[PDB]
Amino acid sequence: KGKLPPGPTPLPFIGNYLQLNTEQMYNSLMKISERYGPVFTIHLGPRRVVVLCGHDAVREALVDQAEEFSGRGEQATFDWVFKGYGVVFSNGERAKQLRRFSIATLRDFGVGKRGIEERIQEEAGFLIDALRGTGGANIDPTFFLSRTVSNVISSIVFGDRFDYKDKEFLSLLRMMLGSFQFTSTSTGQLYEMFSSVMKHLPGPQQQAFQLLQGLEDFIAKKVEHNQRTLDPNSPRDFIDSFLIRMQEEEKNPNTEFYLKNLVMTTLNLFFAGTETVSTTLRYGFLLLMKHPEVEAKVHEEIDRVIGKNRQPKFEDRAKMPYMEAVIHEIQRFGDVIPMGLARRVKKDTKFRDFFLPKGTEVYPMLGSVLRDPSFFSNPQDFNPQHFLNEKGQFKKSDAFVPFSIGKRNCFGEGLARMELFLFFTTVMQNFRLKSSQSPKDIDVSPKHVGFATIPRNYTMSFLPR
Numbered sequence: 231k232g233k234l235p236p237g238p239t240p241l242p243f244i245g246n247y248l249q250l251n252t253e254q255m256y257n258s259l260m261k262i263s264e265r266y267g268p269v270f271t272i273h274l275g276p277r278r279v280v281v282l283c284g285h286d287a288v289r290e291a292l293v294d295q296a297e298e299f300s301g302r303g304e305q306a307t308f309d310w311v312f313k314g315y316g317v318v319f320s321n322g323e324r325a326k327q328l329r330r331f332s333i334a335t336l337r338d339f340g341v342g343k344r345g346i347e348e349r350i351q352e353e354a355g356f357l358i359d360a361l362r363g364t365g366g367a368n369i370d371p372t373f374f375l376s377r378t379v380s381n382v383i384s385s386i387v388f389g390d391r392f393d394y395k396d397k398e399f400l401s402l403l404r405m406m407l408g409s410f411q412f413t414s415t416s417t418g419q420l421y422e423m424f425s426s427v428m429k430h431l432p433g434p435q436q437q438a439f440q441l442l443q444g445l446e447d448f449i450a451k452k453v454e455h456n457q458r459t460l461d462p463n464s465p466r467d468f469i470d471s472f473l474i475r476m477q478e479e480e481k482n483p484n485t486e487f488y489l490k491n492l493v494m495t496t497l498n499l500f501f502a503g504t505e506t507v508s509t510t511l512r513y514g515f516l517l518l519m520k521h522p523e524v525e526a527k528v529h530e531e532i533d534r535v536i537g538k539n540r541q542p543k544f545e546d547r548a549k550m551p552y553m554e555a556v557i558h559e560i561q562r563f564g565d566v567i568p569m570g571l572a573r574r575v576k577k578d579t580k581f582r583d584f585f586l587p588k589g590t591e592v593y594p595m596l597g598s599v600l601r602d603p604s605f606f607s608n609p610q611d612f613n614p615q616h617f618l619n620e621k622g623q624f625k626k627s628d629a630f631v632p633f634s635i636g637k638r639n640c641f642g643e644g645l646a647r648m649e650l651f652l653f654f655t656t657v658m659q660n661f662r663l664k665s666s667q668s669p670k671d672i673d674v675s676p677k678h679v680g681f682a683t684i685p686r687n688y689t690m691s692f693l694p695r
């Protein structure tokens with residue numbers, strides 16, 4: 231045919247807005263999928279987007295045609311601050327340069343290595359201490375968990391951890407959580423469509439912008455302090471590395487290594503390295519209270535493989551298939567980034583006898599892969615067995631795509647995996663969880679779904695084992 235994928239008919243400017251619910255974007259698009267197939271075109275206001283549903287559609291595009299689908303599309307709320315600068319929301323040579331440098335700098339600062347392992351273990355101990363200080367009292371885990379995750383990437387980017395009592399530290403975390411939650415609301419989803427008007431209008435979007443601006447002002451501040459203390463022979467952190475790279479590139483008029491990219495790349499890492507893991511942890515713990523028998527089984531393995539005295543280390547995962555299945559199932563159930571992060575085609579693309587013009591936006595529906603009925607027996611349930619064979623051994627899935635796949639996939643994946651393993655395991659080793667509520671009545675359905683999947687507010691207690 232050589233045509234754009236089929237889809238419902240758009241109206242000028244508003245696009246397919248009347249055919250969609252902004253409170254439930256994922257459900258809206260999946261419903262439209264039922265009629266037009268797993269590869270269809272939608273109009274998010276003025277934005278023309280090809281939607282890829284289910285495993286085969288997403289993998290075929292994003293891996294089998296990796297280079298063709300490896301452009302970055304928009305996220306309107308985040309583009310408000312980044313403006314195409316920094317590593318995440320950027321394109322071509324910019325994205326290429328920053329991605330290469332960031333991957334390399336994270337390694338030099340210990341990621342994938344012993345150095346960051348020791349850093350995560352130290353921070354996990356500070357979490358345990360904090361959770362003991364609650365004295366088994368009913369509490370909101372939110373910022374306890376976010377504090378601990380954040381201090382890991384903070385270590386890499388700013389040179390050291392924040393004090394848990396730093397009021398500015400909690401301030402930044404509130405900005406992150408707030409901006410994130412916004413993008414998952416119906417207004418955040420409306421904004422994805424009508425940002426041309428809405429960025430200039432009053433509303434909840436303006437407050438979202440203010441939190442993002444806060445985060446920007448704080449990085450800009452940390453950079454200035456690093457510049458006026460810089461030893462160009464001994465970098466303390468990501469910032470100093472980037473500042474040093476900037477010096478070496480000072481006579482290259484076409485460099486990507488300028489101040490704005492430094493500020494934005496550093497914001498990307500601080501944000502990405504905090505909020506997704508945090509959210510996964512919070513959702514994980516509530517999932518576990520809803521399924522206390524899963525927790526029982528987690529406990530059996532921890533006590534057997536690790537025992538009571540030593541701290542979990544990363545290699546313990548090799549001997550711990552049940553824990554590996556549990557964390558996999560949390561990432562699968564939680565589905566933190568349900569519609570991925572928008573890609574776009576780099577040049578004129580043929581895909582499944584559709585034609586996709588250059589610059590075409592693409593929604594890889596990661597949530598529809600994580601729930602694909604061809605890969606999971608009961609996609610709607612929480613069930614570690616999804617990731618286990620008959621002998622109780624860990625079973626990988628091609629449908630396991632929470633970090634996405636292809637050329638612009640998550641490069642924090644390894645860090646994220648190390649953190650989820652060590653934080654989950656050290657908490658579970660030290661505490662049993664208690665809900666303020668009866669396991670029968672715990673609501674594990676999402677509070678919001680949009681750009682992210684946000685779980686419902688809850689309190690709990692950590693009782694010593």
Ligand code: HEM
Pocket residue numbers: 302317318319325329383498499502503504506507510566567570571572573632633634635637638639640641642643645646
């Ligand atoms: C459970 C935790 C995490 C999840 C579920 C997650 C998910 C994702 C997803 C879905 C993308 C979009 C990739 C694509 O376009 O296909 C992404 C990109 C990205 N993530 Fe993660 N992430 C997690 C943790 C992290 C961490 C810890 C970092 C810290 C460095 C990080 C940094 C990034 C960056 C810099 C990108 C953009 C890469 C690019 O555009 O080339 N993420 N992540």
Ligand SMILES: CCOc1ccc(NC(C)=O)cc1
Pocket residue numbers: 308318497498499501502506567570571
């Ligand atoms: C889709 C990848 O996950 C992310 C990555 C970055 C961000 N936010 C910022 C400000 O970088 C939010 C979510």
